[PDB]
Design an enzyme around this catalytic site. Structure first.
Site, PDB file in Angstrom:
ATOM      1  N   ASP A   1     -14.769  -5.685  -4.179  1.00  0.00           N
ATOM      2  CA  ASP A   1     -14.900  -5.598  -2.733  1.00  0.00           C
ATOM      3  C   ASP A   1     -16.334  -5.958  -2.387  1.00  0.00           C
ATOM      4  O   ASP A   1     -17.262  -5.276  -2.812  1.00  0.00           O
ATOM      5  CB  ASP A   1     -14.561  -4.188  -2.229  1.00  0.00           C
ATOM      6  CG  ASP A   1     -13.101  -3.795  -2.485  1.00  0.00           C
ATOM      7  OD1 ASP A   1     -12.219  -4.679  -2.463  1.00  0.00           O
ATOM      8  OD2 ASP A   1     -12.831  -2.594  -2.702  1.00  0.00           O
TER       9      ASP A   1
ATOM     10  N   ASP B   1       0.825  -1.206   0.000  1.00  0.00           N
ATOM     11  CA  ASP B   1       0.000   0.000   0.000  1.00  0.00           C
ATOM     12  C   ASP B   1       0.860   1.259   0.000  1.00  0.00           C
ATOM     13  O   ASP B   1       1.527   1.569   0.990  1.00  0.00           O
ATOM     14  CB  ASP B   1      -0.958   0.015   1.189  1.00  0.00           C
ATOM     15  CG  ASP B   1      -1.719  -1.283   1.336  1.00  0.00           C
ATOM     16  OD1 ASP B   1      -2.837  -1.422   0.832  1.00  0.00           O
ATOM     17  OD2 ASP B   1      -1.116  -2.249   2.024  1.00  0.00           O
TER      18      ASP B   1
END
Lengths: 193, 251
Positions: free
Chosen positions: B130, B11
């Site tokens: 998601d 990330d």
């Protein structure tokens, strides 16, 4: 040690330049050129459609440049599409290949395509058995004489690596195969000596 | 035989890894390129870079990241996070990225999946989904898990394949950042709906969670903090999975 990497495409060829520059580090007096005309000890034929690239080698008067390499006991190494080009034809219906090694190219027997990810290559000799990174739909068909490495995808065993004398072919991406790809490329360099 | 993949998720923000890294052996906690270069050295099969740079800079920043990464890492990698059009994706793939991950943009413009697939091939397209349970059904959520789209997961998965996607990154919002195990129920739910490769994401806390995910039908398992914080060794994880009949890449 003059190394030439044919830069005309198609595909990204610079990941290969980087991988080769990477592997050549520990080696003395080493040079690497991007190639698109006549001048090598180790010649690389890279690429990621059989039609294109076979066209680009024509449109750059390289078919003879490569022919002269093979003829002169120089090392000629096809990578990915470059490997398929070593052969007589692919299923690009109608186009002649380099015909450097006898054989043809054929769609993989799988319902799942492309063959994509890390798959095991098992070598007859010389090169490191282990997992390399694959991304392809078509496979080579040739004599066991010219099989160098073997790989199974979906129950289908095919030449993931190929060899006719000092002509070499690899179906995977050594430059995307971590430590073992580096080691593979080192061994290719070590061979052209 | 195609190996089941262990994937590391970096990330990144502005061009830095978030919350750093325990790898004091390195010369930086949070250099995304050195970490990635390292992850290859230690046996990660693939990398996934997720950018969260405030869009002011984001477009320039991600191209910066991709160019620096392609130049040094020797394993396949994937960039995602706010890739909203074919334009952004094209220039990112051309800058050296093996694949791009689209999510919100894809749900809102499915044709985008095809657009990239035709230019760069299906191999270059990863659709991130998601998902989260709303009233007993698996629903698809866009905008980083905050908007419920009303689209059932069962439908979106089949659509994504039809559209020409090459791979699905499935994140259970219910498990993300919980170290309690992957959402194997969700993986098993999706497995039959598509032949596409499935990456399990969210919930990874230890070695067995990885085995559970592969039993559930996943083709790859993605994780972050557990790797960055030296909570799981990669070689050990693979030795463990091999021992229990999973086909991993072992060098």
């Amino acid at each position: 040690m003059r190394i030439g990497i044919i830069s005309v495409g198609p595909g990204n060829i610079m990941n290969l330049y980087r991988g080769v520059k990477r592997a050549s580090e520990n080696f003395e007096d080493v040079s690497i050129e991007l190639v698109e005309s006549p001048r090598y000890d180790l010649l690389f034929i890279p690429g990621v459609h059989f039609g294109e690239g076979m066209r680009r080698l024509r449109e750059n008067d390289l078919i003879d440049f490569v022919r002269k390499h093979v003829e002169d006991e120089r090392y000629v190494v096809g990578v990915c599409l470059g490997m398929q080009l070593l052969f007589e034809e692919s299923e690009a219906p109608g186009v002649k290949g380099l015909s450097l090694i006898e054989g043809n190219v054929v769609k993989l027997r799988s319902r799942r395509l492309p063959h994509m990810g890390w798959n095991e290559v098992i070598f007859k000799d010389t090169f490191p058995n282990g997992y390399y990174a694959f991304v392809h739909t078509y496979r080579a068909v040739c004599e066991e004489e010219h099989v160098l490495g073997t790989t199974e995808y979906d129950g289908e065993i095919f030449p993931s690596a190929v060899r006719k004398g000092r002509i070499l072919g690899f179906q995977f991406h050594p430059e995307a195969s971590s430590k073992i790809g580096r080691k593979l490329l080192e061994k290719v360099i070590e061979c052209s000596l | 035989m195609l190996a089941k993949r262990i994937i590391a998720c970096l990330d990144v923000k502005d061009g830095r890894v978030v919350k750093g890294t325990n790898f004091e052996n390195l010369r930086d906690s949070g250099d995304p390129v050195e970490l990635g270069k390292f992850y290859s050295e230690i046996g990660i099969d693939e990398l996934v870079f997720l950018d969260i740079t405030a869009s002011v800079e984001k477009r320039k920043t991600m191209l910066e990241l991709v160019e620096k990464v392609a130049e040094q890492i020797d394993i396949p990698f994937t960039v995602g996070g706010g890739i909203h059009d074919f334009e952004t994706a094209s220039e990112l793939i051309l800058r050296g990225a093996d694949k791009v991950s689209i999510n919100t943009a894809a749900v809102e413009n499915p044709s985008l999946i095809t657009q990239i697939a035709q230019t760069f091939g299906s191999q270059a397209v990863v659709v991130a989904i998601d998902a989260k349970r709303v009233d007993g059904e698996f629903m698809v959520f866009t905008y980083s898990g905050k908007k419920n789209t009303g689209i059932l997961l069962r439908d979106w998965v089949v659509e994504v394949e039809k559209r020409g996607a090459g791979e699905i990154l499935l994140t259970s919002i219910d498990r993300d950042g919980t170290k309690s195990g992957y959402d194997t129920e969700m993986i098993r739910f999706v497995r039959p709906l598509t032949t596409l490769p499935i990456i399990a994401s969210g919930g990874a806390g230890k070695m067995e969670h990885f085995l559970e995910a592969f039993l559930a039908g996943a083709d790859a398992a993605l994780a972050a903090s557990v790797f960055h914080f030296r909570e799981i060794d990669v070689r050990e994880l693979k030795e463990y999975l091999k021992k229990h009949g999973v086909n991993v890449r072992l060098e």
